[PDB]
């Protein structure tokens with residue numbers, strides 16, 4: 422059986438909390454293995470392992486269960502348990518009713534029928550929440566490798582929403598091909614040398630900040646992966662999202678410094694997000710309204 426190390430402790434599949442299969446009920450599909458909304462009552466998201474899978478798929482599934490179960494932070498999705506002693510195997514997560522951040526931004530964009538559905542403060546609160554999760558990973562020497570809007574979840578659709586990092590698939594893989602690496606979220610030393618440090622997540626966080634303030638656009642509009650690689654290697658950076666306040670765009674450009682040592686750590690990023698949150702010239706800026 423495979424082992425896993427985090428925050429000074431080694432853990433094994435015996436440490437995972439096995440939930441009796443009879444206590445688990447599936448309600449509906451959420452998306453793709455398949456993920457279901459379920460109940461244990463506790464509302465859960467059920468990640469399934471296909472019964473027809475390779476031995477490497479099984480080890481990856483067991484590793485992601487160990488990774489998420491060992492985290493303890495308000496901005497990282499909770500693991501309620503697993504159901505590994507029955508087929509198909511399950512990983513049971515905290516059900517984040519707000520869904521994924523990329524879909525939430527796309528669906529909650531201000532429109533004429535709702536011109537204030539989202540404000541600069543909502544986006545700053547999401548950014549702070551994920552930066553708090555990243556700071557926890559940084560201080561525990563865990564490198565995420567795929568900080569992106571698609572990998573973040575929201576507790577609810579409303580103003581009290583809390584954003585959390587919900588996927589650890591890329592980190593699990595490293596603990597396969599070029600066209601699958603998230604090159605649009607990677608710093609130059611990562612896509613060129615395969616060097617990953619805490620400063621890799623800083624660069625990716627800058628890209629997530631762009632995704633958030635653009636309200637869910639795909640980074641580097643109209644550029645392919647090779648074009649992005651050539652652009653970023655040459656010193657090219659994204660333009661500010663539409664109506665993005667200068668102090669927020671400044672955080673993105675600091676996250677995208679070519680030298681990893683010139684990028685801020687997450688403590689500095691949180692200080693800057695907090696300053697943006699306090700600045701009336703920032704939070705009083707209206708987001709664009711999509712006709």
Ligand SMILES: Cc1nc([C@](C)(O)CO)sc1-c1cnc(N)c(O[C@H](C)c2cc(F)ccc2N2NC=CN2)c1
Pocket residue numbers: 451452453456466468498514515516517518519520521522524525571572573574586587588
């Ligand atoms: C309730 C809910 N609604 C979602 C939609 C369908 O994407 C709409 O936002 S995700 C979601 C949803 C809610 N809570 C979860 N714990 C969850 O975990 C799954 C494994 C997940 C975690 C992520 F970090 C990113 C994507 C996904 N999904 N999403 C689709 C397949 N895996 C998904």
